[PDB]
Scaffold this active site. Structure first.
Site, PDB file in Angstrom:
ATOM      1  N   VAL A 274       0.873  -1.221   0.000  1.00 11.22           N
ATOM      2  CA  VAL A 274       0.000   0.000   0.000  1.00 11.22           C
ATOM      3  C   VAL A 274       0.890   1.245   0.000  1.00 11.22           C
ATOM      4  CG1 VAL A 274      -1.679   1.293   1.347  1.00 11.22           C
ATOM      5  CG2 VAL A 274      -2.028  -1.152   1.018  1.00 11.22           C
TER       6      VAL A 274
ATOM      7  N   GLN B   6      -5.239  -8.922  11.134  1.00  9.61           N
ATOM      8  CA  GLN B   6      -6.036  -9.849  11.995  1.00  9.61           C
ATOM      9  C   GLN B   6      -5.548 -11.286  11.785  1.00  9.61           C
ATOM     10  OE1 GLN B   6     -10.162  -8.974  12.203  1.00  9.61           O
ATOM     11  NE2 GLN B   6     -10.501 -10.330  14.003  1.00  9.61           N
TER      12      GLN B   6
ATOM     13  N   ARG C  52     -11.805  -8.856  17.212  1.00 10.85           N
ATOM     14  CA  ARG C  52     -11.727  -7.487  16.711  1.00 10.85           C
ATOM     15  C   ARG C  52     -11.040  -6.590  17.757  1.00 10.85           C
ATOM     16  NH1 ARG C  52     -12.797  -4.899  12.266  1.00 10.85           N
ATOM     17  NH2 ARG C  52     -13.486  -2.703  12.260  1.00 10.85           N
TER      18      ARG C  52
ATOM     19  N   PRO D 103      -7.854  -1.489  11.389  1.00 13.92           N
ATOM     20  CA  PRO D 103      -9.131  -0.934  10.944  1.00 13.92           C
ATOM     21  C   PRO D 103      -9.216   0.607  10.978  1.00 13.92           C
ATOM     22  CG  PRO D 103      -9.327  -1.631  13.220  1.00 13.92           C
ATOM     23  CD  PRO D 103      -7.914  -1.911  12.785  1.00 13.92           C
TER      24      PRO D 103
ATOM     25  N   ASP E  65     -11.357   3.293  10.554  1.00  9.09           N
ATOM     26  CA  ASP E  65     -12.180   4.274  11.300  1.00  9.09           C
ATOM     27  C   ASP E  65     -11.716   4.285  12.760  1.00  9.09           C
ATOM     28  OD1 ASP E  65     -14.225   5.237   9.215  1.00  9.09           O
ATOM     29  OD2 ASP E  65     -14.279   3.006   9.075  1.00  9.09           O
TER      30      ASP E  65
ATOM     31  N   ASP F 142     -14.123   2.082  -1.248  1.00  8.72           N
ATOM     32  CA  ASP F 142     -15.390   1.346  -1.423  1.00  8.72           C
ATOM     33  C   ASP F 142     -16.252   2.148  -2.396  1.00  8.72           C
ATOM     34  OD1 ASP F 142     -14.986  -0.804   0.738  1.00  8.72           O
ATOM     35  OD2 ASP F 142     -14.843   0.989   1.966  1.00  8.72           O
ATOM     36  N   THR F 143     -16.266   3.478  -2.227  1.00  8.43           N
ATOM     37  CA  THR F 143     -17.048   4.403  -3.085  1.00  8.43           C
ATOM     38  C   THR F 143     -16.521   4.327  -4.531  1.00  8.43           C
ATOM     39  OG1 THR F 143     -17.781   5.780  -1.277  1.00  8.43           O
ATOM     40  CG2 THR F 143     -17.515   6.856  -3.424  1.00  8.43           C
TER      41      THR F 143
ATOM     42  N   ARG G  91     -14.910   1.805  -5.887  1.00  8.00           N
ATOM     43  CA  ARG G  91     -15.302   0.468  -6.396  1.00  8.00           C
ATOM     44  C   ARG G  91     -16.780   0.492  -6.808  1.00  8.00           C
ATOM     45  NH1 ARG G  91     -12.189  -2.536  -1.528  1.00  8.00           N
ATOM     46  NH2 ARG G  91     -10.232  -3.069  -2.586  1.00  8.00           N
TER      47      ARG G  91
ATOM     48  N   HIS H  49     -22.009   9.028  -9.572  1.00 11.45           N
ATOM     49  CA  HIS H  49     -21.929   9.691  -8.247  1.00 11.45           C
ATOM     50  C   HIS H  49     -22.721   8.840  -7.257  1.00 11.45           C
ATOM     51  CE1 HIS H  49     -20.375  12.992 -10.667  1.00 11.45           C
ATOM     52  NE2 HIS H  49     -21.447  12.746 -11.492  1.00 11.45           N
TER      53      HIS H  49
ATOM     54  N   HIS I 129     -15.923   1.515   7.240  1.00  9.84           N
ATOM     55  CA  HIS I 129     -15.284   0.667   6.211  1.00  9.84           C
ATOM     56  C   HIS I 129     -15.211  -0.761   6.783  1.00  9.84           C
ATOM     57  CE1 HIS I 129     -12.671  -0.980   3.286  1.00  9.84           C
ATOM     58  NE2 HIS I 129     -11.880  -1.435   4.342  1.00  9.84           N
TER      59      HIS I 129
END
Lengths: 309, 315, 309, 315
Positions: free
Chosen positions: B17, B85, B91, B124, B126, B151-152, B154, B171, B178
């Site tokens: 990344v 993870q 979590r 994670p 957020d 995600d948006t 995609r 749009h 997420h």
């Protein structure tokens, strides 16, 4: 096959609009060749040199003073050559437009026409009629610039990048055009929704904002004598959507085949455009008020076309 | 004063990344300096050289293996390398593990005198965005997470492909935390201003179940890509470079990001995904999309599950 | 005619180089379609999705897991699929390369081959031999990356944008390549001239700088396990020079027809490249020392080709 | 600190040059704010609106009709609108006329607190670059003239056209005082590193007299373009935007500019055209190209004639 990887544009009209358009295409590296056609041969030679002087700072191009016959293997013919009663204005521009389109067709030109000459919706239809080209390969700039002006005015009221603002002007470019407030939004939040969250924005500021869009050309001409950076930039954006095959949605002059209850005119609506021209005409579901505005714009425009032909 | 016209980014994490992000910043000419911080010092030195080899084809940069102390005069600290993870880890354990690592990053960065924006992409996201806010002491608007930006994208590219339209003319948002609880805002989704509901009326060959599946494929996109090629990186790298351009060019661009809830959607005291305006000073405005009852419920369920984990993690 | 305004690239090899190359083409908006061909079908599907996830932030593209048969109407085939005695390495890569080039030619592909597989000068010649294509439509990346590395190393020594630095590595990409110090310059000031004005720069720093270029891949592989951002970026630059018809000068693997006293090999020298491939091979007048380096690089490479065919 | 990631340009002069320059900056996304200052206030207001109408197709900006006092926090002041030579005016009168106008620009700009770089394109550029230095009190390296940047581009594009090569692969300078005394540096001119002398040996169809004429056409380019279309502007607008990008992106780019002579070429205490390195802090290094005896003589004659006019103008 890579012999085809050469994009050629013939520009008709080397006034402030055509010249600014060529400059925008130079700076953004769009196309590899621009031929500039105008009665004023000395001026087009001077402009081709002045524009060529920029090329060392951008991607290379062949830029020259051209003839209609140079359209033979052009991808794109851009018409900006427009003389300033409405019916007399049209008859004057039809004779000039015939003197452009006929020799361009006679050259063997087989690309897309992009029409920016005023009045654009009428001369877009006229270009279609004179050329014999398919509907989807004659495109007018229509309400692309009015839409940009509308979005930038919303952007400035709300302090947001206009690229995050989504609003249309539609109809015949001119006094009868109208804002599609029903679908206008900022990052997907409709103007109705935005005004509820931000009630400092008065209905009368929105009314004024559309009035300033409708009168924008008058205000700019009054201040600096002419309007050109806006339409030059819009024409270069439409040129990129075609030459990079984008399937981009732009508000353009496109042929009505039942959309909004209209037939057999060119008028402003969002459309998908790619390398083959118009692919899809987006029919925005208008309110009764917005549909009426569209019908009044269309009807007045259809009357002038009928009378002119 | 032009001594300041030098934009500096400190990247923490030189995984696929971080590395892809730095490459995106090289090719697009964003910023003039990238310092790459990672425990694996040889890898960052190798990456700095490999990325620098590209520079003669783009705008120049200083790219180097960096330390936390190099954040002193950075505009932007981009945090990518979240501890993953393990099978059968809770979590809450994932969070506690990432909080100890994140403290070891944020504290020395603050100690350097860094006074810019934190951009958090570590999973994670957020939760670690909130944690970065808590550890740093920075204002809410200067701690930003990538949230639902990818995600948006995609979601928009999936609609673009169904309808044969440039995704830049599409749009639509994914919002919430997420992860599995995120949801599509179909109510405001549109193509050139024509809502998906309007588009489906004009094109009724598009079945409701194709749309349901399309959101499911977006939610599960990372699982599908990891299954096929082992990892996900071009999407988030590109999103991070877009967010980086919005900050460094002061754009006031609307992007879906992790932002601090102060009553929006009936939420408080979490970072969660929603469109926001971002410029050189970070978050300027949080857009509160009026959600349907179903969309608002999805937002509440995403938020409440996320708030429970944060509460448990801080104590 | 605008049906042609669609640029298509088939990439063979979805390793770190091919995948990084596709990403560079996505971010820079070069071409409208990328087909990715690799034995590992799952991986190419995953990469096409991951790359597609970036498209909303750039210009649109069709990106997919492809087959050799998809090369039929491609502009550009980029070969990165290279297996790691020199003669055994070549024989192994020739059988793999035949399994790529033959089905690509059988598809009807009629564009340009761009070869980046190691060893590049040999596999560029092999691609020419297997394909039956004209000399000027088979291009290798040659010393493009070594040249970039050389320029960036000079840029860093002198604190100047590498785009203002002009120096070549030439010959066969590998141990026998050499720096053309005689013509190397910074803003037109030769390195010899620069060293006279700035004598803190010792001859031994320049020697070391070329040695670090020659050993760059070894040093990067040692540090991070592989090399890819450099060559990916070079391949995307060469792709832009072809698809935008630039007549750009780049150091490439090109066919020797008497240049430097060489014949019937591909080797690294500056060349002009446009939409039709190699237009002009620049023959830099080398010093006796530089010409000797070129002859030794060529001769050793010609021996391996002869033995391999 | 990211409050500073906002680049501001004050343009003085809204003629064809200033206007085209601002349009180049709009289309290329350079800077975030352009204030346009001109006596003709309505024209600048009209231009600010017309240019702003373009912004939805590019990166956002604040563009407005400005005053000298808006230079307070500007990165860059770009001076374009030189009072033109009247028929039968001396060179020295042209200078004296432009010095009174230039004082009325520079003094209020300095009074505003402006602390950035002056970029001077007003004719005569080398003289008004020196005058801007003298009036402003700014360091030598923070007063830059466009000098021979455009003449050099014209020269490179002419060679590009003769040889059918991208001008970005052509490397040749015009140096000296921009105007009739400027000269071509043939000795170092090259195409992809092959000198013109080397290129002419390999391609002897290229006659010496075609090269002589090619420099003459460059020297007389402005006269030819003014004769044909009435004015020259796209060339210098593009050059000014390139110099503006080199400063604002801190590139350390080599460009031919008007820079202060401190012994280079045997010159002192003038601004004159030569390649230099420019970054966010202005001029970093003046490149002294080793000239032939003939090229050095051309440089001396250009310099001496220019120094005489400056001497006479200041007293």
């Amino acid at each position: 096959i890579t012999d085809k990887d050469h994009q050629k544009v013939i520009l008709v009209g080397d006034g402030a609009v055509g010249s600014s358009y060529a400059y925008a295409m130079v700076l953004q590296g769009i196309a590899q060749e621009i031929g500039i056609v105008d009665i004023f041969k000395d001026k087009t030679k001077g402009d081709a040199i002045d524009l060529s002087n920029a090329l060392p700072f951008t991607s290379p191009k062949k830029i020259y003073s051209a003839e209609y016959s140079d359209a033979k293997d052009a991808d794109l013919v851009v018409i900006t050559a427009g003389a300033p009663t409405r019916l007399d204005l049209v008859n004057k521009n039809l004779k000039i437009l015939k003197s452009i389109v006929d020799p361009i067709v006679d050259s063997g030109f087989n690309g897309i026409f992009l029409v920016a000459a005023n009045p654009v919706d009428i001369l877009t239809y006229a270009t279609w009629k004179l050329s014999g080209f398919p509907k989807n390969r004659v495109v007018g700039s229509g309400t692309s610039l009015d839409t940009a002006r509308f979005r930038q005015s919303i952007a400035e009221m709300v302090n947001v990048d206009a690229r995050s603002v989504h609003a249309y002007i539609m109809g015949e470019h001119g006094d009868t055009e109208f804002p599609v407030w029903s679908h206008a939004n900022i990052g997907g939040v409709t103007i109705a929704e935005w005004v509820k969250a931000h009630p400092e924005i008065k209905e009368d500021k929105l009314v004024k904002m559309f009035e300033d869009v409708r009168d924008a050309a008058y205000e700019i001409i009054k201040l600096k004598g002419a309007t050109f950076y806006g339409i030059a930039t819009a024409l270069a954006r439409i040129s990129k959507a075609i030459l990079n095959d984008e399937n981009a949605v732009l508000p353009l002059s496109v042929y009505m085949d039942g959309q909004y209850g209209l037939n057999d005119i060119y008028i402003g609506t969002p459309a998908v455009i790619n390398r083959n021209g118009i692919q899809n005409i987006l029919e925005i579901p208008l309110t009764d008020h917005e549909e009426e505005s569209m019908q009044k714009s269309a009807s007045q425009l259809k009357k002038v076309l009928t009378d002119a032909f």
